[PDB]
Amino acid sequence: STGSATTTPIDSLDDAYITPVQIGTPAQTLNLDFDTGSSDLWVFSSETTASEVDGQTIYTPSKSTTAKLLSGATWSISYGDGSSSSGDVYTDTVSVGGLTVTGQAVESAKKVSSSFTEDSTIDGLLGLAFSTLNTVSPTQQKTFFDNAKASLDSPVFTADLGYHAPGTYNFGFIDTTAYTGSITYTAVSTKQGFWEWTSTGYAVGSGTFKSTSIDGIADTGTTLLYLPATVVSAYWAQVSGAKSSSSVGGYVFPCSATLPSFTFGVGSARIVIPGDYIDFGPISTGSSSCFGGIQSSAGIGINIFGDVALKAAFVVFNGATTPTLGFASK
């Protein structure tokens, strides 16, 4: 089997991407944030505290003929941005882009933090990291990908995120029309439950490539590119008037600037992030200070190849017995 679903930016900055997901019988379609940095499929629901729901579409298990309470199971998750959610668990039928899993754990939120409530466009998350990170207790649950894997034509999914445009998540096949050149594969460590890999270095604009190992995760659920402070300083030093602002919480730059590109290495291959991808617009409405898309990972404890980096590539998440990542230009 295979599946193919379009993923759509939630706003004009590509702050996140939403993908429609069918849950239950008859189908209830929710728009979920597919997150390769976590392993829980959780949704706004009929159980979510009413004051914490503000425009999201909810899953109502009582209206699904295939929903079953997973008796005694609870979940609770905290993300890198300080957000959180928790609740109880149902199993149900879940379909993505025509690919169906029966008996998927659907984590129903009883509580969500303010950042979730305030984002009316995201109805929940669909985790695509390794199932060792799943938070369900006392019986840990499998991701949608892990449950689908054995049925798929090939044990893979691909992320093809757009810049200010829709893109695609495919399951079970690699669309050879969706990228240019060849795919370069690179090793993955699953020791922290992430799609963790080592980039071979970077360049700023037209500058020379610096060969240096940068360990980090491929994380579709993180907006920005978070790298070591040395790398990030080298980037922003090429932008007149850019500075790190402790008041704003990262590097800002004059909105009048033209930003340089940023290249990262994948083995001997190179992915180029155009400068425009690094502009996250005014820090507050009407400001002439703009927020940068490349930020320091210092204090986060891991480097994160988030959407700024991934949207410049066609990315293969290869879930074979020994997982690997693939990157191609597009």
Swiss-Prot record:
The keyword Signal applies. Disulfide bonds join C255-C290. One of its GO terms (biological process) is proteolysis. Its EC number is 3.4.23.22. It catalyses: Hydrolysis of proteins with specificity similar to that of pepsin A, prefers hydrophobic residues at P1 and P1', but does not cleave 14-Ala-|-Leu-15 in the B chain of insulin or Z-Glu-Tyr. Clots milk. One of its GO terms (molecular function) is aspartic-type endopeptidase activity. The active site is at D35, S199. It is an enzyme of class 3 (hydrolase). Keywords: Aspartyl protease, Disulfide bond, Hydrolase, Protease, Signal, Zymogen. Residues 17-328 form the Peptidase A1 domain. It comes from the Eukaryota. The keyword Transit peptide does not apply. Belongs to the peptidase A1 family. This is Endothiapepsin.
